[PDB]
Amino acid sequence: NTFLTSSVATPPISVIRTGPKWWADPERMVRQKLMYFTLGVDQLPLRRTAVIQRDLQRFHMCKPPPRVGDSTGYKRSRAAQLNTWYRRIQYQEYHMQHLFTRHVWGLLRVYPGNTTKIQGKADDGYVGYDSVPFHRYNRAPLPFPARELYERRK
Amino acid sequence: VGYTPVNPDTSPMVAYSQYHWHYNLPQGMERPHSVNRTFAAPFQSNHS
Amino acid sequence: GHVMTPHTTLHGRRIFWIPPTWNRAGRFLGPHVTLYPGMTP
Amino acid sequence: MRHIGQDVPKRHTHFVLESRLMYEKSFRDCWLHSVCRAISQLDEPLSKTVVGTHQKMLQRKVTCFQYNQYGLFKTPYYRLANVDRYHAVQGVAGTREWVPYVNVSYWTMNKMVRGGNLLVHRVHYTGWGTDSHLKKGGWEHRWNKVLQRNVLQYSRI
Amino acid sequence: SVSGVFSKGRGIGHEATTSILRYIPRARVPWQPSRFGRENLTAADMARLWSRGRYRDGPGNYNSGYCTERTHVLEENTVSIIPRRELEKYMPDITIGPKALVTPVSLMNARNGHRVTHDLLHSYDPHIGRLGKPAVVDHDNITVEDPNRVGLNAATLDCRGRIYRWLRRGPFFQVDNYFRRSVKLNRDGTLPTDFVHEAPLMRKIIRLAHRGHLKAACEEYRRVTTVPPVEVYRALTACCVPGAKLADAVSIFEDGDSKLFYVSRD
Amino acid sequence: EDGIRGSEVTYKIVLEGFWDHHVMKLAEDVCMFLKDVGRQIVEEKLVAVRRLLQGGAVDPELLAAFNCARAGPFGGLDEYDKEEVANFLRSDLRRLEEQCLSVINRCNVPVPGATNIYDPHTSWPHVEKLEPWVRMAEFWTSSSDTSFTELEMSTAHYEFRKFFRVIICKLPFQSTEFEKRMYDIRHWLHRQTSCEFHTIYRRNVIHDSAVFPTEHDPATPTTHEHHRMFSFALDWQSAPVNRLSTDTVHEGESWDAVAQRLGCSVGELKDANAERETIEAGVVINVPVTAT
Amino acid sequence: FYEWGRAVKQFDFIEFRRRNGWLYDLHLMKCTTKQVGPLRDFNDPDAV
Amino acid sequence: LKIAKSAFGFYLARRGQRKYPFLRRPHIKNTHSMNPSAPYFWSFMTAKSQMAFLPEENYITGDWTGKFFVSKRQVYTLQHATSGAKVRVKSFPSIFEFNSPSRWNIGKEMNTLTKPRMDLIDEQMLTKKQRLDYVRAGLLPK
Amino acid sequence: RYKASPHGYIRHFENEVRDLLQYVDGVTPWKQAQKIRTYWEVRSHHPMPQFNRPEVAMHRNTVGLLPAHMWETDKKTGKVKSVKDSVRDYQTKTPYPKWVQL
Amino acid sequence: TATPERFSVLGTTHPKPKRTGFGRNNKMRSKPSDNVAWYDKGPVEWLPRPV
Amino acid sequence: MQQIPGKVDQTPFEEDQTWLLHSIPVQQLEMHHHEKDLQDLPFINHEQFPRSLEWNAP
Amino acid sequence: YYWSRYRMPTQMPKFDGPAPVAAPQSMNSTKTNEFIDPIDDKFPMSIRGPLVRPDVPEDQYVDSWYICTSMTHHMGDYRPWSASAPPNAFRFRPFNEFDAKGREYVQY
Amino acid sequence: DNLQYKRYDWQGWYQRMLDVHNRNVSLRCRICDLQRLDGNGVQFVDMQTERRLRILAQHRVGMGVLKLDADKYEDQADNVTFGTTKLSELLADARKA
Amino acid sequence: WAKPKKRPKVGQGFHEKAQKWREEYLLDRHRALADSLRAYVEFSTSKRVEPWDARFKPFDRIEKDGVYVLMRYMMEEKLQLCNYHHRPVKRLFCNIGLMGPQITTKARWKPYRFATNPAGTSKAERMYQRDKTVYTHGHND
Amino acid sequence: GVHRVGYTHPSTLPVPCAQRWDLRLARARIFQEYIEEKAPGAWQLEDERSMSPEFKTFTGYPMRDMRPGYGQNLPDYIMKKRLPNNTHYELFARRDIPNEDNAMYGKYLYDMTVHGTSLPSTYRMHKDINKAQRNDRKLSGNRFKVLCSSGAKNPPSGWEPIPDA
RNA sequence: UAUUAUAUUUAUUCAUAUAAUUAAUAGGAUAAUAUUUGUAGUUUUUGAUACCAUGAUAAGGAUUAUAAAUUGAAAGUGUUAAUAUCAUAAUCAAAAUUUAUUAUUUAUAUUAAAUAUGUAUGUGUAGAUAAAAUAAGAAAUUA
């Protein structure tokens, strides 16, 4: 991993709201798929996501279907329910990506960006060479040189 | 309008007015001028 | 749009009576103008 | 003088005339100045014929001559003030407050365009224009194309 | 009740003419009958006026180095001048003198028509630098003070029409005036051709042409300030004959003829 | 070359207006003018040519010009008789008649329903378009001392424009008369319209192996050191170099010894010096220009 | 040719014409006065 | 301008905080000209080449009566220290004198020896409002 | 007066350059042009005229460059507290460069 | 020359104050913030840092 | 590129590191061009005559 | 006088009478353009069509100086599209075989 | 200029300024027409002479046309002199082949 | 656009104060300069932490193999002569050639300010514990 | 690589042939050319932007040279540089001036030829007319300010100003 | 009610001016002859100024919609034309922060040409604020 510096975390929903621009950008989604496939694990959530989003993109310039007014509000609530389903289908994916990426990085002897967990290796966030001399969230002092997660041979 | 007067060649609001030639009319020369031919001056320099 | 069509009041294809003039209109280009032309054969 | 019988409404218009004379002085001094600069700063030998102690000597002789020239106009052009020939309003060139081909300030350009005095053509305020070259690469590109037809189309001899 | 700029002034023209001339009414400019111009300033006042108007370089400005005041006040603080003898102790004197201010005629075209590197522009015509008398530039005596007041001063009284005149001048103005105010046929019908300071140069040209060095001779012909004598043209064309150079013989002849007063017609 | 693609002289008149239609209609005007004047001149030339074709003598001078060679292609001084020379002359005149006729015939194509002055096959002279000069001015419309933002938000775009048409006339010969009419069209041009005149003509240059001789590279070569900055002003003369056309005869010398020293045939050295029959010591002599 | 348009020479030529009393053709020096009215139509008096 | 510190206060507008093209601001005010660097000491705000000659302003060019201050692009030379002659420079309020000569100055331009913006402030050139605003920024005590 | 005049670029001015040189040399006494100094000749009298900037050779700086005898150090910190006066005792055989005789 | 014992006017002036805080307008406190990760919940820290 | 014979010289570097770690500087002050300086900046684009940018010298 | 030129040659039309049919006249709150024709804009685009100016090859139009509007560089004369092309030219075209680009690359 | 700078005190300097803006004189010749028998029966420019001509004048040749643009002097006359000279000097050197 | 208010007069005896303050600001600057030159040179002369980032390859490898072998036997002397300053160290690695294209491409180096720490540096805090009285631009210890 | 550039003189070859460097010196004599001795062999860099048809900005010629440090200062820059003489700067110097007609002719000349007389500027005329109007009602809000004061302070022997009320 | 959606995203440490005289014309080689080479008559006026001394163009989204079509407005933001009756204040370099009205580069490699910024590492952390539905990708609470 080349990008090492401390970062700003964005809530999952705003990441998903980027649609085609980032979250569903074809290019990105394909190399996620590559990671999964190479690990020998089906990519179902990715495929659900890709389906939902593919279709989002196809109809993205159309006006929504005409609404008739109801005291029930069954329509509004069914649209909502469907929507939060899709949101959750994608939360699951977003989680999977962060999960597997961290795990794979643990196998590749990769050091993550500052303040990032790698389950077996760095439990509290890993940090080295931050702009700030302490670990940001522990409030503990950082050693020089940067802490090493892996034994030396390569 | 001002103490500095408009100069009639560069201003389209003079040039294209009703008292002059608009840019959408046909732009040919109006009348010929023969000055030097009709009455000619003899050359006398200011310097010897 | 509808948030500006006080200020777009000249901008469609408009028959005029008196055409606007540069003293009275700062940025308007004229009624015949097409800013976003499509390609036509 | 001393505001007795002044002919022009703005006194400062005269400064514009002063400016003209500055450019005149530059035409009179540019070649000279630059030659003295180039011969002064040259580290490599000047030539086959002038080398070594002669060259060092001649260099110092020249910069001594150049320092002796009182009133020789060395001021770089971008440091001269731009001031209107009409209302004597000033603007920084390369900024939106100075208009280069008419050489008037924004204030005068506005006044002159709106009451028709300049003949220009209005183009949509937000784009690059009617012009092909500007449409391609913007200001820098058009700048380049001007260089190309002033200089590069010639194979000099 | 009366506020003047200048206390006293003087007449441009002298007793013999004026005392009689006054009986003939002269028409003054209708809208401003009285004229007090920069010819009419006294000597002192002219000096003062002429110092000012030259931005920083000019002698008027207290820090130019030409200042005659012994003291100057910056924001209530009085500063005493550092004399030049003292200034020199840490700031070496490299001063060529007035010859440094005048380039040769040879360079006049590089310089857009000038021989003079002074701070005011110097015109070679009679009128722009005219005071009461016609302007004449000394190339030996050029000073920062400029006693004859022939330079084009940007800010002085009466300057404006002079500046305007200078900006209207024709493409060869400097050059033409310089050339016609010197170099003109003598009252006897003799050619201007024989001058003491240029003689050895003409000799050298002739000499070079007789030994058949056409290029060296032509290269010296270039540096001639004054009309060259007939003998030069004779020598130069005679040199063109044996190698058959015709184009060159012809351009030589045509150069000396009807440009230079027809020295070449011989 | 034949037809449209070749000529002795080309004039391009570049007309410039402030408005496009101005320059378009000016180009029609000037174009029809040159069509008429062109036809008149070229017709005149054509009758001169037809007369020269019908018959004529040969200059002694033109014959002499064919016969100046030390050796022709067949490796000896060649004798052109007046016949042959007249035949060359005649062939060129033939070609000139074809070209004249081509110009005239295109002058007569463009009638009122049918006029197209853009294609060169259909008319003489023809017209080429030239991309317009367009400068866009960007500036503040506000006068505000207080805020930069408000100044930027008021920005206008206006353009200066200049429009151009080009008129091309290619002629098979050069006529000062045509050139004169053409320079004079600037006096009757349309209102607020100007023009340039481009000329491309053919001209004889002369390469003198005498003034610019072709010699071996010097025995010592020239370094990069003769090329410093200001080497142009210091280490070099302007070409051509001056080589002496006059030499003095040394004491023991003789015609052939002098010729040997100067690098000539003795014949040459005698021709250049024809006045002198014999050469004494200390006498001044003319060096034949071909001398090596 | 570089010098022939100077104003001094243009106005001197005018002065020469003035001493010979022929000013009729000169541009600066003539003031046209008379205007030529339009031609009426029987197709309408009304149209202004 | 709001306050006129010179004549130009009358002629010029500020135009808020307005952007100028790179390295052209109409008025050359070199606040940075004395800005300490040990490693860059000989390259910062000095001649780009050490083989350049000293400027015009280290020399007496013409016949002078005398000067009041020497220019600030003049470079401090061993003689400036040794000769014991007046060396003045125009700074604000009035003039800065080099009174106490040191060799550590040598070879740098007086631009670099004269602090343009002093940590010292006159309370008497300040309006009561301006003094308030200087207390807000934590400069003046009050 | 009627001459062919070069234009634009300075190369084309070869003639003029020669003349400007000749003239300059003729008018300008060596006695005066002596006195014009180059920055390094002047800086030779600064107490620390020569060292490497950080870009290339920085690690080649030596402790021998420091003029330690010029200043006064604090023993505990290892820091420069004061600087001795430079000018009073300063002896040099070369106020101007060796080749300058005024 | 010869660095003096006392400086009359040099240290005389009012000392610039230390900033009390950080970030925008120097007024922000140092405290735990939203951007802070939680390492106690699951394999991924939360919210997850960019990867 | 032709070079002066007898002069010790270098060839354009093939390795990225050779470029990166050499002493080549970055542009820092305002930037100059010997022809283009006369037309001041790209925004002040000085034009003596309004010739077509495509004008062709005869 | 130099000014003798700027006199009126003809008597200018008087203002005798009232505002024209469907004039803009503004009551208590009215947004009024003097510029827009009241009657000819109100008239449906379906009927009148999107045209502002006659449908004619645009070479006949000039973008006016100082007025936001186009004018005809021959006052008021109009030539129809048919007069730009050859007789009976398919989609008025210099030649019927191809469109502009088709013509270019065929030629190449 | 026929318009504005036609007739008054500025007509002179504007005229001269155009003339100096226009000093360039383009000198062309086809290399084809240089290959001809010289007065001595030897071909004036042969293959080797042409190769040498091309290498000597680098970007000054294109489409087999040698083109010199003579800008050096303010007046066109002097530029045809100059241009013509450079041409014969360049031929003189190319002919060494 | 309001007429500009006039500026109050300068001060009385402020010309003396400004003279003195600038005078001894300069005198102080002499010692600040002297001291920072001392510091700069002391830094150039003294050793630094290793410039390469060991978290990546070819540097992570056990100190008994690979690049470290290449360093211990061929480059050691030179690496010590330049005191592990990051610029000459990286250049020496380019010139040893037995790594070759990798130095810039595969290998990672510590950031500027970390690489500048004195040899022996244990805690990161050290970057901030260097002297601020001295004008070296972070080139001081 | 770091190498010594090298040159084989044709006399030494087993066929004489004209060496490209020698030709280069020929070309430098003909069009007089500065040969930069210090030009680094490694620095050949075309200007990608203008010289590659891949960028929209493609002029076909090397618009700028890509050298970071290059400045108007350097003798090399000075040697190839366009002097300001007869460029647009000169055109501005002459044609852009406060009253544009003073570019075409002397005002006095024109006025005296066209009108019989010199005419004051419009501004001056305004102040004149105004004085006449307001001197007709009030008097003595005035002042007497001249260029030269002696004419008022010692007036001629005659000159007895008409008393006013 | 039909002629159809604000609750999304991204932002916020913002500073820069100085060394007083505005008043008119005047032509040169290749022209049938002008020393007009070197054209010489001080002195009666007063406003745009540092100063009261009218006019005129900015910015500022809130309901004429989709087709062959523009998301920038008139209500006026220093410099401009009839009120005068304290004063030379104007850049041609190298210069002195208090002013509402300003998007700066945040950790592998860091000062070469006009001289060009030494300072604020602190858990992306108060209060309060900014911008956008336009070749992009946002969809349901009108008067």
Ligand SMILES: [Mg+2]
């Ligand atoms: Mg207002």
Ligand SMILES: [Mg+2]
């Ligand atoms: Mg002034």
